[PDB]
Amino acid sequence: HLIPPLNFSMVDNGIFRSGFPDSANFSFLQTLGLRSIIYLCPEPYPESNLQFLKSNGIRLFQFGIEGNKEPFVNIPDHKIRMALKVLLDEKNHPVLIHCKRGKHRTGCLVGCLRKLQKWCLTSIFDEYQRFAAAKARVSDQRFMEIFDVSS
Amino acid sequence: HLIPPLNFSMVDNGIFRSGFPDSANFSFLQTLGLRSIIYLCPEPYPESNLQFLKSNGIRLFQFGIEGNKEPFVNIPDHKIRMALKVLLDEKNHPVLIHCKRGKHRTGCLVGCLRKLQKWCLTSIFDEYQRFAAAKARVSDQRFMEIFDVSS
């Protein structure tokens, strides 16, 4: 039996999203035929994970984004854009976007992707909320409402 | 601006799921390049919806499933299997699976798809819940735990 990583989901044709994966997720992850992974956390990639990467020849892009709690949050506009770039490159697909719980950081990146795709904030936020659930934060969505989509 | 249908989401490569679409959803639905739609409600398809179908040459498969409330629920094993058949035929993709709110009926079908794909119930249920949310019902998931995936 396969076990998709935490909060796993297919964003678009060659894009995927989820929380931090572990051993239990490799077999499934092996199914996607991932060509690269966009890691959004500053912590170093664990050993087992890295092994899986080499074994499977998956490029690892990492744009470390400090993870804070609602009271005072702050998303790096640059790092998101940097990730948005890689994501937008067809060459990099299949891509798996992931952070810690695959809710806020991952949720912001995918949110800006949607904005680019011309989705209304209403629809964009809704998708965002579907994953963050009880932990869905206003800050992230505000960051999206203000994202200057001008490529 | 585009407005994906209610609870829209991409299930797998050529499969999609959502609630009952309306005018505000067509523009977006036009993007998907849908070849067919798996409708799971017994109610007749509204006029505007039908117009869009023909205009877009989308084949409508309908497997009406009575929609009841938790106290006493009952999913037609037959109708789900039939829909699962259509779903499994690559010829039909891109497919949009949808019912009323895109939670239970749509959720079950996608649920059994995952079972086929060898996902563990734990993961399968989690996805199901992600969409039903506060309206997530045990009945449905039970129907999944007991689905005979023997093709």
UniProtKB/Swiss-Prot annotation, chains A, B:
Catalytic activity: 5-diphospho-1D-myo-inositol 1,2,3,4,6-pentakisphosphate + H2O = 1D-myo-inositol hexakisphosphate + phosphate + H(+); 1,5-bis(diphospho)-1D-myo-inositol 2,3,4,6-tetrakisphosphate + H2O = 1-diphospho-1D-myo-inositol 2,3,4,5,6-pentakisphosphate + phosphate + 2 H(+); 3,5-bis(diphospho)-1D-myo-inositol 1,2,4,6-tetrakisphosphate + H2O = 3-diphospho-1D-myo-inositol 1,2,4,5,6-pentakisphosphate + phosphate + 2 H(+); 6-diphospho-1D-myo-inositol pentakisphosphate + H2O = 1D-myo-inositol hexakisphosphate + phosphate + H(+)
Activity regulation details: Inhibited by manganese, calcium and zinc ions but not magnesium ions.
Keyword vocabulary terms for this entry: Hydrolase
Transmembrane segments: none
Principal EC category: hydrolase
EC number: 3.6.1.52
Residues of the site described as Transition state stabilizer: R105
Residues at which 1D-myo-inositol hexakisphosphate binds: N74, I75, H78, K79
Top-level taxon: Eukaryota
Entry annotation: catalytic residues: C99
Subunit-structure text: Homodimer and homohexamer; behaves as a monomer in solution.
Family statement drawn from the similarity comment of this UniProt entry: Belongs to the protein-tyrosine phosphatase family. Atypical dual-specificity phosphatase Siw14-like subfamily.
Protein name in the entry: Inositol diphosphatase DSP1
Name of encoding gene: DSP1
